[PDB]
């Protein structure tokens, strides 16, 4: 599954469910429910989260790595855990709702990220 | 099967094949491929100049088959990009030989092979 019943999403980097197009797909879904403009904030930048932003950007949202709309919460060790602050089991069926064709968009619609 | 103009470059609408996150994703990870297996080169870098969707999309696929990217120069591979409406993407050093070795890679149907992992390479901005 993508979230844990604690309301987590972890894994091995590169293996479902933190693959580059599924944490592409959290990060569409991500910004989507929050626009159904808005900002996650990342820890660090790594393979996981630069996923994760592309699809946050690819719906018309904005990333930076220091904190707006959404924050997500990494702690790297035996596996990756992450973590979305705020989603409450709610947020967490809207989004499970979406994610199972989410809408994309292009040109200067596509959000920005900043270092 | 090509996606390199006769000016050696790629070029197109953000978001817009050649420029989805999908085929970007997959660029990154053929250019990455193509440094480690024909220039031999086991953890090849890749230089971007700024970042955007466009960059961050490529570098997660360089990431992905084991190379490590950073903002700025002193990579194996560097980027160029041009932007505005059309985006104008130029690699250097890649050769025409270079260009049709990327090409044969990203439209050939052999899987092209991701890393996991530690294996995966890191990104500093």
């Avoid at 972890?10 to 910004?31: H, Q």
Wanted: charged share 20%; aromatic share 10%; with cysteine.
């Amino acid at each position: 599954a993508i979230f844990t019943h604690e309301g987590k999403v972890e894994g091995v980097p590169g293996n479902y469910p933190l693959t580059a197009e599924n944490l592409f797909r959290i990060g569409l879904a991500l910004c989507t429910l929050w626009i159904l403009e808005p900002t996650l904030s990342i820890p660090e930048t790594n393979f996981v989260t630069l996923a994760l932003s592309v699809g946050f950007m690819n719906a018309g949202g904005s990333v930076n790595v220091g904190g707006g709309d959404i924050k997500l919460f990494l702690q790297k060790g035996e596996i990756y855990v992450l973590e979305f602050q705020p989603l409450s089991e709610t947020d967490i069926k809207k989004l499970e709702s979406i994610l199972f064709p989410i809408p994309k968009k292009t040109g200067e619609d596509i959000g920005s990220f900043k270092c």
